[PDB]
Design an enzyme around this catalytic site. Structure first.
Site, PDB file in Angstrom:
ATOM      1  N   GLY A  43      12.067   4.053  -5.243  1.00 10.54           N
ATOM      2  CA  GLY A  43      12.411   2.679  -5.665  1.00 10.54           C
ATOM      3  C   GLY A  43      11.690   1.620  -4.831  1.00 10.54           C
ATOM      4  O   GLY A  43      11.668   0.478  -5.276  1.00 10.54           O
ATOM      5  N   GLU A  68      -5.111   4.682  -4.246  1.00  6.38           N
ATOM      6  CA  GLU A  68      -3.714   4.526  -4.754  1.00  6.38           C
ATOM      7  C   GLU A  68      -3.382   3.060  -5.055  1.00  6.38           C
ATOM      8  O   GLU A  68      -2.196   2.782  -5.310  1.00  6.38           O
ATOM      9  CB  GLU A  68      -2.746   5.156  -3.749  1.00  6.38           C
ATOM     10  CG  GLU A  68      -1.356   5.449  -4.328  1.00  6.38           C
ATOM     11  CD  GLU A  68      -1.332   6.323  -5.566  1.00  6.38           C
ATOM     12  OE1 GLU A  68      -2.313   7.081  -5.773  1.00  6.38           O
ATOM     13  OE2 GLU A  68      -0.347   6.215  -6.343  1.00  6.38           O
ATOM     14  N   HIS A  79       0.057   5.506  -9.226  1.00  7.75           N
ATOM     15  CA  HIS A  79       1.059   6.424  -9.832  1.00  7.75           C
ATOM     16  C   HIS A  79       2.032   5.716 -10.793  1.00  7.75           C
ATOM     17  O   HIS A  79       2.739   6.435 -11.533  1.00  7.75           O
ATOM     18  CB  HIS A  79       1.738   7.262  -8.761  1.00  7.75           C
ATOM     19  CG  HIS A  79       2.693   6.526  -7.885  1.00  7.75           C
ATOM     20  ND1 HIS A  79       2.387   6.242  -6.573  1.00  7.75           N
ATOM     21  CD2 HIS A  79       3.981   6.157  -8.082  1.00  7.75           C
ATOM     22  CE1 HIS A  79       3.428   5.644  -6.013  1.00  7.75           C
ATOM     23  NE2 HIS A  79       4.421   5.590  -6.917  1.00  7.75           N
ATOM     24  N   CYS A 112       8.373   1.884  -3.880  1.00 10.78           N
ATOM     25  CA  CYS A 112       6.911   1.884  -4.147  1.00 10.78           C
ATOM     26  C   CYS A 112       6.529   0.540  -4.747  1.00 10.78           C
ATOM     27  O   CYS A 112       7.239   0.009  -5.644  1.00 10.78           O
ATOM     28  CB  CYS A 112       6.418   3.081  -4.972  1.00 10.78           C
ATOM     29  SG  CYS A 112       6.614   4.615  -4.013  1.00 10.78           S
TER      30      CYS A 112
END
Length: 182
Positions: A146, A72, A41, A148
């Site tokens: 914040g 991911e 992402h 990730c």
């Protein structure tokens, strides 16, 4: 404070950079040579900022399992003038549960942040922001915007990177040794 935090600090001080894309600032784990990981992402493009240096992306691969399900994790090769310490021997070989993990973050927002998250479950399937995702680790901590890209470690193992939460629980994408064979 203890050997958990000691191992986490050792990883943060030599194997992390601050990565900036158009989708924000992320903790980014360097694994070996010029190869790093970031949550998919982050939407890595042709150019990324590494510790505020404009850097060409030589290759980026959004990983999916052999069911063609999102993992991911994006693996990035950076046009950087310096190699990372090779930490591939700290990556687990198989999907597993863990005790007594630390989540470590380093950005502008959250410098030198370490969180003892406790027990880590092999959760498996998660609908993550509406995207079916596999190989998710779950921990009981109210992680925030914040964090990730944050590194999840136990003593002697780098097991995941933080990819989301639901306000009560946090979720990490597994790191496996087989992702970084060359």
């Amino acid at each position: 404070m203890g050997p958990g935090f000691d191992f986490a600090q050792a990883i943060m001080k030599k194997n992390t950079v601050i990565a900036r894309t158009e989708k924000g600032e992320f903790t980014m784990l360097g694994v070996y040579d010029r190869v790093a990981v970031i949550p998919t992402h982050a939407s890595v493009g042709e150019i990324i900022y590494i510790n505020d240096v404009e850097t060409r992306v030589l290759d980026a691969c959004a990983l999916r399992d052999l069911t063609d399900t999102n993992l991911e994790i994006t693996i990035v090769k950076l046009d950087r003038n310096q190699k990372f310490r090779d930490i591939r021997h700290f990556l687990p070989r198989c999907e597993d549960d863990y005790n007594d993990a630390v989540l470590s973050v380093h950005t502008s927002k959250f410098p030198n942040m370490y969180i003892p998250v406790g027990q880590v479950t092999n959760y498996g399937f998660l609908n993550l922001g509406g995207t079916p995702t596999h190989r998710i680790l779950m921990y009981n901590f109210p992680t925030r915007a914040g964090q990730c890209g944050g590194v999840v470690t136990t003593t002697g193992k780098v097991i995941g990177i933080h990819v989301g939460g639901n306000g009560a629980q946090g979720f990490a994408a597994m790191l496996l040794h087989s992702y970084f064979t060359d």
